[PDB]
Design an enzyme around this catalytic site. Structure first.
Site, PDB file in Angstrom:
ATOM      1  N   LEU C  41       0.841  -1.180   0.000  1.00  0.00           N
ATOM      2  CA  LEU C  41       0.000   0.000   0.000  1.00  0.00           C
ATOM      3  C   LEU C  41       0.883   1.239   0.000  1.00  0.00           C
ATOM      4  O   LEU C  41       2.002   1.228   0.520  1.00  0.00           O
ATOM      5  CB  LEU C  41      -0.930   0.013   1.213  1.00  0.00           C
ATOM      6  CG  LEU C  41      -2.286  -0.695   1.266  1.00  0.00           C
ATOM      7  CD1 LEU C  41      -3.305  -0.055   0.322  1.00  0.00           C
ATOM      8  CD2 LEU C  41      -2.158  -2.195   0.992  1.00  0.00           C
ATOM      9  N   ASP C  42       0.392   2.298  -0.626  1.00  0.00           N
ATOM     10  CA  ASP C  42       1.024   3.592  -0.450  1.00  0.00           C
ATOM     11  C   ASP C  42       0.478   4.202   0.835  1.00  0.00           C
ATOM     12  O   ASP C  42      -0.364   3.626   1.529  1.00  0.00           O
ATOM     13  CB  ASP C  42       0.826   4.482  -1.677  1.00  0.00           C
ATOM     14  CG  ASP C  42      -0.631   4.706  -2.034  1.00  0.00           C
ATOM     15  OD1 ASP C  42      -1.214   3.874  -2.762  1.00  0.00           O
ATOM     16  OD2 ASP C  42      -1.185   5.748  -1.621  1.00  0.00           O
ATOM     17  N   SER C  43       0.943   5.401   1.149  1.00  0.00           N
ATOM     18  CA  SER C  43       0.638   6.031   2.422  1.00  0.00           C
ATOM     19  C   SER C  43      -0.761   6.611   2.487  1.00  0.00           C
ATOM     20  O   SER C  43      -1.144   7.129   3.535  1.00  0.00           O
ATOM     21  CB  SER C  43       1.643   7.131   2.692  1.00  0.00           C
ATOM     22  OG  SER C  43       2.945   6.645   2.443  1.00  0.00           O
TER      23      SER C  43
ATOM     24  N   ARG E  41      -9.317  11.095  -5.154  1.00  0.00           N
ATOM     25  CA  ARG E  41      -8.166  10.184  -5.118  1.00  0.00           C
ATOM     26  C   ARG E  41      -7.195  10.476  -6.254  1.00  0.00           C
ATOM     27  O   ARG E  41      -5.972  10.544  -6.055  1.00  0.00           O
ATOM     28  CB  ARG E  41      -8.656   8.749  -5.214  1.00  0.00           C
ATOM     29  CG  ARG E  41      -7.531   7.746  -5.253  1.00  0.00           C
ATOM     30  CD  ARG E  41      -6.883   7.759  -3.911  1.00  0.00           C
ATOM     31  NE  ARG E  41      -5.520   7.267  -3.888  1.00  0.00           N
ATOM     32  CZ  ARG E  41      -4.763   7.390  -2.812  1.00  0.00           C
ATOM     33  NH1 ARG E  41      -5.292   7.980  -1.756  1.00  0.00           N
ATOM     34  NH2 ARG E  41      -3.516   6.946  -2.779  1.00  0.00           N
TER      35      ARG E  41
END
Ligand SMILES: CCCCCCCCCCCCCCCCCC(=O)OC[C@H](COP(=O)(O)OCCN)OC(=O)CCCCCCCCCCCCCCCCC
Ligand SMILES: CCCCCCCCCCCC(=O)OC[C@H](COP(=O)(O)OCC[N+](C)(C)C)OC(=O)CCCCCCCCCCC
Ligand SMILES: CCCCCCCCCCCC(=O)OC[C@H](COP(=O)(O)OCC[N+](C)(C)C)OC(=O)CCCCCCCCCCC
Lengths: 163, 243, 85, 44, 106, 246, 77, 52, 124, 83
Positions: C41-43, E41
C-alpha cells in the site's frame, strides 16, 4: 359513577401511585397498571363524547374556594365543553397509545418506573389544563406541563445535551 | 434560616405596621419612588444571580428578588396587593429556609465546600435529595399551587393597578426568577457524577422531616390560600387610603 | 441482542481486504500483515482502508489513532477495544 | 477505475436491485382494485 | 514546507482522512459518492511528486482553504460517540462505598 | 380545531414509525443519510409511515384532506383582501411539506443502502407493544376526518359554542366563491411534486448533489434552522450573560 | 328562498348569529335531524343538500349584486 | 451473518406482519378510491355556483 | 484575552495567571481528560469568566461568523416581509359582495339599542 | 445493556431495574387502593356536578334583566353607544 370526575382522578392515581409505590411494585407491574388506567380513562372519554353528541349539555364539577379576596373569587371548577371534549379525546387517545408503545420501546431501559410516572403526570396536567373553567386552572395546567417537559426532556440526567 | 425566614419578613411587617397608618398623605407622594427602587431591585438583583460561583449566595439573591416583589404589593394601595404580600412573606418564610437547608445542611455537612464547580450529577447517588432540589426549585420560582405564586400573582396584580407600566416591567420577574434557579438546579441534578465528590450518605430522617414540613406548608397555602384569610380580612382593608 | 467476538472482527477485516483491489494479492493475508509493506500500500490507501474499516464497523477514529494501526492485528484489537459495534 | 469495486456490489445486487426496490411501494393496491371493482359492480 | 517525511505524511494522511469524511456527508448516493471519491483520489495522486517547498506549501495551504470551504453543518457521527445521540445515555455509576461525615447520624 | 384533532393522530403515527425504524437499526442511528433502503426489510413500518405521510400531504380520502385543505381555501374565500397573499404562502408550504416527506420516505425505504451489511442482517420488526398502537392510530388517521367532519365542518353546526361575529364568518362564502383552478390546484400539485421528487432522486440524483458553493451556503443556512439559534444564542443569551456579569 | 323566520323564533331555536339570514328556515330542521342522529355523515344528507342549495341561490344573488356594482363603478369613472 | 460484502439474503418476515401490511394497504387504497368515487364533483371542484 | 470583556477585566486581576479563554466544547472530544464530560484536566487553570467558557455555557456555533449570520437572518426576514408587502399590490379582487343581514343587520340580536346601532351593527 | 449498579441506595421510584419478588402480591394492594380511591372520589363529587343549561328558569333571567334595568334607571346611566 361520575364521568366528569373519573377523567380527572384516574391519571392522578396513575401518577401518584408509581412514585409512592415504585420500589414496592416494580416496573413490570407499574407499566401495565399505568397503561391500564389510562386505557380506562380514554374509554370513559370516548363514551362521554358519544353522550354529548346526544345533547349539547356539558357537565362541570365544583370544588372548594381557591381565594376569595374583595372583588375577585377563584374556584377549582372543571367543565367539559365541546371544545374541551374535542381536545380531550385526542390527548387521551395519543396518551394511551404512547403508553402502550413505550411498554415495548423502553424494555431494556432501567428507569421506566419514573418514565411511565412522568408520562402520566404529563397526561394529568394536560387534562387539568383543558378541563379547567377559569383562566387560573388553565394557568396551573399550563405551568405544570412545562415542569413535566423539564422532567421528561431531561430523562437521561447523565446526558449533557439533554439537560 | 432565622435571618432569611424571619428578619426580612419582620421589615415587611414594619412597613405595614409603622408607615401605612400615619404617613398616608406622604406615602401617596412617594410610591413612584418605591416603584423605581423595587423594580430596580427585582431586575438588577435577579440579573446579578446569573454569574455566581458560590451556592448559598444564589439563594440569598433569590430572597432579595422575592422581597422586591413583596414591597410593591404592600405599597400598591390595593387590598389584593396587601394580601398577596402577606401570602408571599409567609410562603417565602417556608420555602427559603428549606433551600438554605439544602445548600447548608445536606451539602455543606457532607463536603464542606460551597463552590458550584464541584457539584454535578447528584441524582445517581442521591435520588431523593435531587427530588427535593427540583421540587424546591420549582416551589421557589412561582410555579403555582405553592403559595409563592399566590403571593407573586396578587402582588404583581396590585402593582399593576397602582401603575400599569411598572406592573408590565415587573411581570418579567416570573422569567428572571426561573432563569438562575433552573440554571442551578439542572447543574446540580444533571450530568455524570462528580469526580471531586466521593459518595456519601443519602438524606437522613431529620433532614427529610424538616423538608417534608416545609413543603407541606407551602402546598397547603398553594392549594387553598383562604385558610388564613380569617386573620387578615380586617388588616387588608385597614391600610387602604382611597378616600 | 447482537454480540461480536474476535473471530468476527477477523473474518470481517479480512473480508474487507480481499474485496480491496490495490493489495498485492488475496492470500498473503493473515493477522500479522503490515499494510505498509506486506500488502503493498502507499501512504494514502492505508488511509482509504482506514476510512473503509471505520465505516465498516460503524465507528469513528480520530487522526492520532488512525495513524498507528499499521498492522492488521493492531487494527483488530483496536476495533475490539470499543464497546460500539 | 474504482478501487473499492468489489466491496460496493452488494448495494446493487439481489435485494436492492431496481426491480426489488419498488415492490412493497403499493402493497394493497392489487386487492383494493378488485375490491373497488366488486363495490362498483355491487352498487347497481 | 517539508519534502518526503514522517510529519508531512502525518499532515496529508489526516487531510485525506478529512476530505474523505467531509465528502461522505454531502453526497446521498453511493455511486455518486464513490465516483467523487475516486475523483479526489486522482486529485491526490496527480500531486505527491512535488519536490519544492515553495509550491508544496502553496498548494498545501490552498487545499487546506479548499477543504475549509466545503465544510458541513452536521457531520455523520455514530450515536454512541461524542457527537451522537446515544452518547452518555446510561453511564454506569462507579462502584463506591459510602463515605461518612457524621459520628451520630448516617 | 378540526386540524388540531387530525394532526395529533398523524404526528403520533409518524413519530412512532420513526422510533420503530430507529429502534430496528442495530446502530441506533438517526441520520437519514445512513439509513439506506429498508422497504424489503420493514414493510409494516413502511405501510404505516406511508399512511401517515399521505395523510399529512392532504391526499384525498384521508384525514389530512379534510383538515388541511379547507384552511388553504379559507385563505382565499376570506372577506379581507390581503388574505389572498397568505393563500399563496400556505400553498407554498403545502408543496414543501410534500417535498421533505418524500425525502423521509425515499432515503429510508427506496434508496440504495448506505449502512454496513450487518444492520441489514439484523433488521427485524419490533414487538407487539410497538406495532399495535401504530395499527390503531393508522386506522384513526384514516377514518377520523370522515366521521368527525359533520361535527366540526357542517355548514350549520351548533356543536362548538364559539360565537363568531357575523362579518368575520366567511365559511359559506369560502366554499362557493372558489375557482375550479384554485380548488383543483393544491391537490394535483401536491401529488405532482411528490411523484417528481421521488423520480428525480432515483433516476438522476445530480440535481440535488450539485456542489455550487452558493447553493451550499444557502443549504447550510436552511440546515441550521434559518440561522435563528445562532441569532438567539450569541445576541440574546450570551449578551445577557455578559451584561449580568457586568 | 324559504320564508324568513321571525325574530323570536330565531331566539327559540338558538340559531347562531352568523347563521340568521333568509336561508335559516331550512337550517333548523337540519340541526334537529343532525341531533336525531349523532352528526353522522352518511345520514341526514337530503336536508343538508336542501340547505346548501338555498345557500347557493344566495351566493349567486351576491355575485349578481357585485357585477352590478362593477358596472356602476366604471360608468362613474 | 454468514456473508460479508457480498449478496444479502432475502429477509425473513413473519406471516402475521406480512398479512397485516397487506390489510392496511388494501384498506387505504380502497378507502381512498371510495372517497374519490363519491366526492368526485366536490373533490375536483365542478358545477360552480357562480350564475351565468 | 480574546474577548472584549475578558480584556475589560485585565486590570482588576493581580496574582492571577491570565489564561487565554478557550471554549470547553471546541476542544477535542477524543483526547482523554480526567472528566470526559467537562473536558478538563484535573488541575488546569480556570479563566476569569470561566462559566462563559464552560461546558454548561451556550453552544457557540462554529459554521458561520456571527456578523455573517445576523446579516443572513435579517436578510431572510426582510426578504419575506418585503415580498409580502409588495405582493399586496398585485392582488385580484372579489367575485361576490360581502353578505348582508336581516332585522337591520341583527343589531337587537347583537346587544344594542337604536341609539347604539352603529356600534353594534351589521351590513343590512 | 445490564451494567452493574450499587444496591446501597434507596429511591422511592425504585432505583435502576426495580422488580421485587412479590410484585403480584403488592399489585393486588395497589389494585384495591386505586379502584377504591377512584370509586370514592367518583361518588364524593356527585352533588357538586351540574349541567350548563337548564339550571334556572327563563323567568329568573327575564326578571333579573328587568331589575338591572331598574338599577340602571335610578342612576341615569346611559348606553355604551350614545355619546
Ligand atoms: C403539586 C405538588 C406535586 C408534588 C408531588 C411530589 C412527588 C414526590 C415524589 C417524587 C419521588 C420520585 C423519585 O424519588 O425520583 C428519584 C429520581 C431517581 O430516579 P431513579 O429511577 O430512582 O434512578 C436512580 C438512579 N438515577 O431522582 C430524579 O431523577 C429527580 C427527578 C424527581 C422527579 C420528581 C417528580 C415530582 C416533581 C413534582 C414537581 C412539583 C413542583 C412543585
Ligand atoms: C387540582 C388540585 C386540587 C388539590 C386537592 C387537594 C386536596 C383538597 C381536597 C378538598 C376537596 C373538598 O373537600 O371540596 C369539597 C368541599 C365543599 O365544596 P364547596 O363548594 O366549597 O361547599 C359546598 C357549597 N354548596 C353548599 C353551595 C354546594 O370543599 C370545602 O369547602 C372544604 C375546604 C377544605 C380545603 C382544605 C385544604 C387543605 C389542604 C389539603 C391538601 C393538603
Ligand atoms: C426553495 C429551494 C431552496 C434550495 C435549498 C437546497 O439546496 O435544497 C437542496 C435539497 C437537498 O436535499 P437532499 O438531496 O435530500 O440531501 C442533501 C444533499 N446535499 C447535501 C448535497 C445538499 O434538495 C431539495 O430538497 C430541493 C428540492 C425542493 C425545491 C422545491 C421543489
Amino acid at each position: 359513577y361520575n364521568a366528569i370526575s373519573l377523567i380527572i382522578i384516574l391519571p392522578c392515581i396513575s401518577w401518584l401511585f408509581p412514585l409512592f409505590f415504585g420500589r414496592q411494585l416494580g416496573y413490570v407491574f407499574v407499566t401495565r397498571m399505568t397503561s391500564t388506567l389510562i386505557i380506562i380513562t380514554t374509554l370513559i372519554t370516548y363514551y362521554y363524547f358519544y353522550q354529548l353528541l346526544g345533547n349539547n349539555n356539558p357537565i362541570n364539577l365544583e370544588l372548594f374556594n381557591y381565594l376569595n379576596i374583595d372583588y375577585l373569587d377563584i374556584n377549582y371548577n372543571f367543565e367539559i365543553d365541546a371544545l374541551t371534549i374535542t381536545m380531550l379525546l385526542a390527548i387521551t387517545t395519543i396518551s394511551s397509545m404512547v403508553h402502550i408503545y413505550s411498554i415495548g420501546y423502553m424494555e431494556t431501559d432501567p428507569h421506566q418506573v419514573r418514565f411511565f410516572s412522568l408520562l402520566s403526570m404529563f397526561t394529568f396536567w394536560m387534562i387539568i389544563l383543558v378541563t379547567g373553567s377559569n383562566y387560573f386552572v388553565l394557568f396551573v395546567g399550563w405551568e405544570f406541563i412545562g415542569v413535566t417537559s423539564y422532567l421528561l426532556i431531561s430523562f437521561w440526567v447523565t446526558r449533557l445535551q439533554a439537560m | 434560616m432565622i435571618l432569611a425566614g424571619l428578619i426580612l419578613k419582620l421589615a415587611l411587617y414594619a412597613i405595614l405596621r409603622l408607615l401605612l397608618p400615619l404617613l398616608c398623605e406622604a406615602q401617596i407622594l412617594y410610591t413612584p419612588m418605591i416603584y423605581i427602587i423595587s423594580l430596580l431591585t427585582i431586575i438588577l438583583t435577579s440579573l446579578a444571580t446569573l454569574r455566581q460561583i458560590d451556592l448559598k449566595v444564589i439563594i440569598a439573591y433569590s430572597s432579595i428578588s422575592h422581597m422586591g416583589i413583596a414591597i410593591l404589593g404592600v405599597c400598591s394601595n390595593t387590598s389584593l396587593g396587601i394580601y398577596g404580600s402577606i401570602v408571599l412573606g409567609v410562603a417565602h418564610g417556608f420555602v427559603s429556609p428549606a433551600l438554605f437547608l439544602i445548600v447548608g445542611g445536606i451539602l455543606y455537612d457532607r463536603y464542606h465546600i460551597r463552590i458550584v464547580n464541584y457539584y454535578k450529577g447528584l441524582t445517581t447517588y442521591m435520588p431523593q435529595l435531587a427530588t427535593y432540589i427540583i421540587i424546591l426549585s420549582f416551589a421557589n420560582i412561582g410555579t403555582p399551587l405553592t403559595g409563592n405564586f399566590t403571593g407573586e400573582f396578587l402582588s404583581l396584580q396590585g402593582g399593576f393597578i397602582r401603575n400599569p407600566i411598572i406592573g408590565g416591567i415587573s411581570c418579567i420577574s416570573v422569567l428572571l426568577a426561573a432563569i438562575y434557579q433552573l440554571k442551578l438546579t439542572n447543574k446540580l441534578t444533571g450530568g455524570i457524577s462528580s469526580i471531586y465528590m466521593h459518595r456519601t450518605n443519602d438524606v437522613t430522617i431529620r433532614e427529610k422531616f424538616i423538608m417534608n414540613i416545609l413543603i407541606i406548608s407551602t402546598l397547603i397555602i398553594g392549594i387553598c390560600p383562604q385558610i388564613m384569610y380569617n386573620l387578615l380580612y380586617w388588616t387588608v382593608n385597614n391600610y387602604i387610603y382611597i378616600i | 441482542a447482537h454480540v461480536l467476538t474476535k473471530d468476527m472482527i477477523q473474518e470481517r477485516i479480512v473480508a474487507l481486504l480481499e474485496s480491496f483491489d490495490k493489495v498485492n494479492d488475496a492470500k498473503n493475508i493473515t493477522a500479522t500483515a503490515n499494510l505498509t509493506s506486506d500488502l503493498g500500500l502507499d501512504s494514502l490507501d492505508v488511509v482509504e482502508v482506514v476510512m473503509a474499516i471505520e465505516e465498516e464497523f460503524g465507528l469513528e477514529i480520530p487522526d492520532h489513532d488512525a495513524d498507528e494501526i499499521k498492522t492488521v492485528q493492531q487494527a483488530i484489537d483496536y476495533v475490539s477495544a470499543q464497546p460500539a459495534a | 477505475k474504482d478501487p473499492w469495486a468489489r466491496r460496493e456490489a452488494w448495494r446493487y445486487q439481489t435485494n436492492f436491485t431496481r426491480a426489488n426496490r419498488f415492490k412493497g411501494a403499493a402493497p394493497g393496491f392489487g386487492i383494493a382494485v378488485v375490491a373497488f371493482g366488486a363495490y362498483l359492480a355491487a352498487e347497481k | 514546507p517539508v519534502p518526503f517525511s514522517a510529519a508531512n505524511k502525518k499532515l496529508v494522511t489526516s487531510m485525506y482522512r478529512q476530505s474523505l469524511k467531509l465528502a461522505r456527508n454531502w453526497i446521498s448516493n453511493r455511486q455518486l459518492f464513490r465516483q467523487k471519491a475516486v475523483e479526489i483520489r486522482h486529485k491526490f495522486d496527480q500531486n505527491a511528486q512535488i519536490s519544492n517547498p515553495r509550491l508544496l506549501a502553496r498548494t498545501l495551504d490552498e487545499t487546506r482553504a479548499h477543504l475549509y470551504e466545503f465544510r458541513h453543518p452536521d457531520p455523520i457521527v455514530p450515536p454512541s460517540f461524542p457527537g451522537g445521540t446515544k452518547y452518555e445515555r446510561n453511564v454506569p455509576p462507579r462502584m463506591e462505598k459510602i463515605m461518612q461525615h457524621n459520628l451520630y447520624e448516617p | 380545531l378540526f386540524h388540531l384533532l387530525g394532526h395529533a393522530f398523524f404526528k403520533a403515527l409518524l413519530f412512532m414509525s420513526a422510533g420503530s425504524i430507529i429502534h430496528s437499526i442495530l446502530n441506533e442511528s438517526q441520520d437519514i443519510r445512513t439509513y439506506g433502503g429498508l422497504l424489503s426489510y420493514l414493510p409494516y413500518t413502511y405501510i404505516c409511515i406511508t399512511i401517515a405521510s399521505l395523510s399529512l400531504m392532504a391526499m384525498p380520502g384521508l384525514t389530512g384532506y379534510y383538515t388541511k385543505d379547507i384552511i388553504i381555501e379559507s385563505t382565499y374565500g376570506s372577506y379581507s383582501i390581503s388574505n389572498y397573499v397568505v393563500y399563496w404562502i400556505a400553498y407554498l408550504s403545502a408543496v414543501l411539506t410534500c417535498v421533505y416527506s418524500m425525502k423521509i420516505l425515499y432515503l429510508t425505504f427506496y434508496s440504495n443502502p448506505n449502512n454496513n451489511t450487518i444492520t441489514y442482517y439484523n433488521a427485524h420488526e419490533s414487538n407487539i407493544y410497538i406495532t399495535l398502537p401504530m395499527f390503531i392510530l393508522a386506522i384513526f388517521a384514516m377514518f377520523a376526518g370522515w366521521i368527525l367532519k359533520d361535527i366540526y365542518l357542517g355548514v350549520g353546526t351548533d356543536f362548538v359554542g364559539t360565537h363568531i361575529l357575523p362579518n368575520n364568518f366567511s365559511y359559506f362564502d369560502t366554499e362557493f366563491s372558489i375557482t375550479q383552478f384554485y380548488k383543483l390546484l393544491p391537490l394535483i400539485s401536491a401529488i405532482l411534486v411528490s411523484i417528481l421528487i421521488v423520480v428525480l432522486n432515483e433516476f438522476f440524483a445530480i440535481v440535488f448533489n450539485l456542489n455550487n458553493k452558493y447553493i451550499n451556503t444557502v443549504y447550510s443556512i436552511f440546515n441550521q434552522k434559518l440561522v435563528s439559534d445562532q441569532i438567539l444564542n450569541h445576541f440574546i443569551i450570551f449578551k445577557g450573560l455578559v451584561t449580568s456579569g457586568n | 328562498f324559504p320564508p324568513l323566520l321571525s325574530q323570536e323564533d330565531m331566539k327559540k331555536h338558538k340559531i347562531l348569529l352568523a347563521y340568521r339570514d333568509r336561508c335559516a328556515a331550512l337550517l333548523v330542521p337540519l340541526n334537529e335531524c343532525r341531533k336525531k342522529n349523532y352528526y353522522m355523515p352518511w345520514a341526514c344528507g337530503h336536508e343538508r343538500h336542501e340547505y346548501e342549495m338555498c345557500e347557493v341561490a344566495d351566493f349567486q344573488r351576491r355575485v349578481k349584486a357585485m357585477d352590478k356594482l362593477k358596472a356602476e363603478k366604471i360608468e362613474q369613472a | 451473518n454468514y456473508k460479508w460484502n457480498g449478496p444479502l439474503p432475502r429477509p425473513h418476515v413473519s406471516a402475521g406482519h406480512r398479512i397485516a401490511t397487506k390489510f392496511l394497504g388494501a384498506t387505504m387504497f380502497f378507502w381512498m378510491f371510495l372517497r374519490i368515487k363519491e366526492e368526485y364533483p366536490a373533490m375536483l371542484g365542478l358545477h360552480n355556483f357562480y350564475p351565468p | 484575552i480574546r474577548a472584549s470583556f475578558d480584556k475589560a477585566e485585565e486590570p482588576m486581576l493581580g496574582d492571577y495567571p491570565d489564561i487565554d479563554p478557550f471554549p470547553a466544547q471546541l476542544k477535542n472530544p477524543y483526547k482523554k481528560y480526567d472528566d470526559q464530560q467537562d473536558r478538563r484536566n484535573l488541575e488546569e487553570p480556570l479563566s476569569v469568566n470561566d462559566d462563559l467558557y464552560d461546558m454548561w455555557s451556550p453552544d457557540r456555533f462554529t459554521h458561520f461568523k456571527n456578523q455573517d449570520a445576523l446579516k443572513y437572518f435579517i436578510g431572510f426576514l426582510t426578504i419575506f416581509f418585503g415580498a409580502s408587502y409588495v405582493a399586496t399590490y398585485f392582488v385580484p379582487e372579489k367575485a361576490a359582495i360581502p353578505r348582508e343581514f336581516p332585522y337591520e343587520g341583527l343589531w337587537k340580536e347583537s346587544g344594542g339599542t337604536e341609539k347604539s346601532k352603529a356600534f353594534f351593527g351589521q351590513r343590512s | 445493556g445490564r451494567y452493574p449498579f450499587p444496591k446501597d441506595v434507596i429511591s422511592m421510584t425504585g432505583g435502576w431495574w426495580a422488580n421485587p419478588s412479590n410484585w403480584k402480591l403488592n399489585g393486588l394492594f395497589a389494585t384495591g387502593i386505586a379502584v377504591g380511591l377512584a370509586l370514592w372520589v367518583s361518588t364524593a363529587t356527585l352533588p357538586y356536578t351540574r349541567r350548563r343549561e337548564g339550571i334556572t328558569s327563563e323567568s329568573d333571567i327575564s326578571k333579573w334583566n328587568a331589575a338591572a334595568g331598574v338599577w340602571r334607571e335610578r342612576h341615569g346611566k346611559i348606553s355604551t353607544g350614545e355619546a
